[PDB]
Amino acid sequence: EIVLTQSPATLSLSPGERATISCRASESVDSYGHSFMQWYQQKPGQAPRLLIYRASNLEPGIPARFSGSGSGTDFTLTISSLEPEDFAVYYCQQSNEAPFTFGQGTKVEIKRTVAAPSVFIFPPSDEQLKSGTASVVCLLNNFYPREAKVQWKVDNALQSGNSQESVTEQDSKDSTYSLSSTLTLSKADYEKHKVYACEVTHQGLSSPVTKSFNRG
């Protein structure tokens, strides 16, 4: 098996910058006078898309900003000038030996300028309140960087081990992120309290912001 090791694993660059991803094969990918190295682009919820094949040939339909080179055991993929839509995981693929193989992939994040999250909070809806379970959702919409912090507070009581987070994939239009924090409490706990607060700390906020609501 020909092992393909891509480098770097993660890349964070601002639009307009030049990106270079490398791939090193354990054994030559060269045969019959050609390097059988392909490069694929995979975006969230989509299939890998062919960018370059046979090492240096641009796939028709693909913007000229993409190009590849190399031969033998060393290959390189280049994006001369990043656009916010280039956010994706890139894979090098080998078509020369027994079992075809893909590199481990390089995650490319598009560096965007600091963007502060717009905080929202949602109390558990009447329906779910009948199910004997309460879910409080705090929304962090359109921010960057991705690193953020969300503490829950129930009547000034700092929660712990009872909330789950889910962050969206970077937007391909404006490169921001959105995050969701859900607090799951029993119907009893929620009713025996009143102040539900969501404190968010982020680089775009000069001071942590808190969003809250009183039940009912």
């Binding site: 890998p48 079992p99 929202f120 959105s178």
Partner: protein, 218 residues
């Protein structure tokens, strides 16, 4: 134009069998080698199988040999993959791919997910996420849908029948302790249309034949 429709994915018990198919279209199917590639949730891409133009030859890595069978029906322009003795390690997103003479897979299927688990199918519950009146981001109101407790993946959440795509965010689903998934879908709208217009979120969980149309409003 050239397109590959995949189907047959879903939930299946460990040790079970499942068949994926890929209906080719827009090109001389019998003139190409076909591939099945898979992606374990969150991991990378792995080759699963290859078959020649007329089905004469086929290849599989040792981890699939004897368990999976790739085949094709050139008269129906369809590619198949019969799986057997499935295990958790086999759960993943499966793709079909066409292979050019220049050694490059240029067209791929959208993909079909295969979850290998003994756990049972559970339809999701949809609770609204209306905008509180105390919440006022100036001219924008955020409201969404909460799809809780369902299995397996995935779930499809749209708004006003796909008519409302702008500004929508459907977060990736998280697994809860119980053993079920949960995800939220929110959309930001101009607070001047909150009462003005009607907002409905269309949820579809194909593995349980559930299609809910919960309506939200503060």
């Amino acid at each position: 134009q050239v397109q590959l429709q995949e189907s047959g994915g879903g939930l299946v018990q460990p040790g079970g069998s499942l068949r994926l198919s890929c209906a080719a279209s827009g090109f001389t199917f019998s003139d190409y080698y076909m591939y099945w590639v898979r992606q374990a949730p969150g991991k990378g891409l792995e080759w699963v199988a290859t078959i020649s133009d007329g089905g004469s030859y086929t290849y599989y890595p040792d981890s699939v040999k004897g368990r999976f069978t790739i085949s094709r029906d050139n008269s129906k322009n369809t590619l198949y993959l019969q799986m057997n003795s499935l295990r958790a390690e086999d759960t993943a997103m499966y793709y079909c791919s066409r292979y050019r003479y220049d050694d490059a897979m240029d067209y791929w299927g959208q993909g079909t997910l295969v979850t290998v688990s003994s756990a049972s199918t559970k339809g999701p519950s949809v609770f609204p996420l209306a905008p509180s009146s105390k919440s006022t981001s100036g001219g924008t109101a955020a409201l969404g849908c909460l799809v809780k407790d369902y299995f397996p993946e995935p779930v499809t959440v749209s708004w006003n029948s796909g008519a409302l795509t702008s500004g929508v965010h459907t977060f990736p689903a998280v697994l809860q302790s119980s053993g079920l998934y949960s995800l939220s879908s929110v959309v930001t709208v101009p607070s001047s249309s909150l009462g003005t217009q009607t907002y409905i979120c269309n949820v579809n969980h194909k593995p349980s034949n559930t299609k809910v149309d919960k309506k939200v409003e503060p």
